[PDB]
């Protein structure tokens, strides 16, 4: 493995102060670093660490061409939608994972940070779209959605609606409606330059 010693900047991904709204989900090209995943996988911090196309035990031996770390805040009952072959308004219109995905979908309950007594509404999701997303498609587009045959002409009306709904996280909403921060660590395996590496000597 390469003559490199700098630890992965997972600190800038997980313990970041501000997370993206899922409709505008953030991405970081994690690269050129030694990524220890055991400190993540073994933590009690996370409420799920399920992985696809790889085993969380094994992957500390692996090396990859890059990690894309994607992150967003979603509802508790929407965490299930962040998985291959799933359906729902998040998977269809906000964040689509490919069938052949390989990676880990990490989530933890973040109600202590992402809710306020008067409700937090800064976290926002696309409720309406014409057609489902392609895998890792991302449209920040604010353009008003038209549901009917009647043209909307940029004014909200009886069959055309502003496409984004605020989640509304009050501290009281319960475990299913509380906010969860999600990180989707995605891998690609093929290429000759191994660029993010395990802690093997």
């Amino acid at each position: 493995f390469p003559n490199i010693t700098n630890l992965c900047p997972f600190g800038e991904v997980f313990n970041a102060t501000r997370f993206a709204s899922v409709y505008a989900w953030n991405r970081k090209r994690i690269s050129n670093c030694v990524a220890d995943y055991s400190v993540l996988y073994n933590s009690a911090s996370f409420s799920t660490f399920k992985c696809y196309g790889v085993s969380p035990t094994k992957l500390n031996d692996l090396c990859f061409t890059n990690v894309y770390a994607d992150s967003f805040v979603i509802r508790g009952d929407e965490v299930r939608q962040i998985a291959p072959g799933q359906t729902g308004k998040i998977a269809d219109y906000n964040y689509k994972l490919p069938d052949d995905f390989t990676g880990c979908v990490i989530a933890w309950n973040s109600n202590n940070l992402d809710s306020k007594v008067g409700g937090n509404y800064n976290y926002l999701y696309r409720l309406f779209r014409k057609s489902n997303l392609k895998p890792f498609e991302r449209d920040i587009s604010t353009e008003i959605y038209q549901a009917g045959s009647t043209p909307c002409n940029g004014v909200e009306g009886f069959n055309c609606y502003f496409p984004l709904q605020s989640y509304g996280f009050q501290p009281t909403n319960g475990v299913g409606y509380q906010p969860y921060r999600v990180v989707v660590l995605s891998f690609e395996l093929l290429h000759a330059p191994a660029t993010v590496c395990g802690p093997k000597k």
Epitope: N111, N112, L113, S115, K116, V117, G118, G119, N120, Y121, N122, Q170, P171, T172
Partner: antibody
Amino acid sequence: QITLKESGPTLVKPTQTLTLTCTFSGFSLSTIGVGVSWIRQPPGKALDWLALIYWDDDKRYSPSLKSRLTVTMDTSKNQVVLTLTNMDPVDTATYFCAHGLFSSSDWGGLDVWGQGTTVT
Amino acid sequence: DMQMTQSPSSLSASVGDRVTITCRASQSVFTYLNWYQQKPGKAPKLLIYAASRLQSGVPSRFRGSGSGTDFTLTISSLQPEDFATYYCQQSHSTPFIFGPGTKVDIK
């Protein structure tokens, strides 16, 4: 210094902005959970909650004044200013700015208040 | 919408008496309700953070109770300096409307 605050002018004319200010000490209003809320009281009448600004610049207004009321801040001066845009004499009142705590651990207790100012 | 009312719009009382003040909140407010007292021309003082949660700097004769839609405040035995007007506040639905106030009368 322990948490303390004050408020601005008292002279009013009707078709004018009230252009109040509030200024404070002992809290940053940038620490997570800190908020400051505006409460008015007509003389000998109920309290009337006007508005609240949180940390991270989230703003809330009383719905019947939302079209007619704005609040804004300066993280550097430790000031908040409220500008009700046009006094109708029902708006004559004492105005207060009160501190509170508003994060997930907190309860929105308006725990310390300024002495407030009359508006004529 | 949200609305907030208090049952004894004024209550006659005397020193040493038990007294109780009652708040009805239209929607479920959970425990996010506050109690304030005001002496005329002074700013209100917060007494209760949340139902049953007493402030520091407030004597043990003040306590409150309830949850959801109906809430209560109780003073076990009035000192004469406790005579004031009392306001509830809800701290959950985004306009934190106060109640109409309840004044205790020496009468």
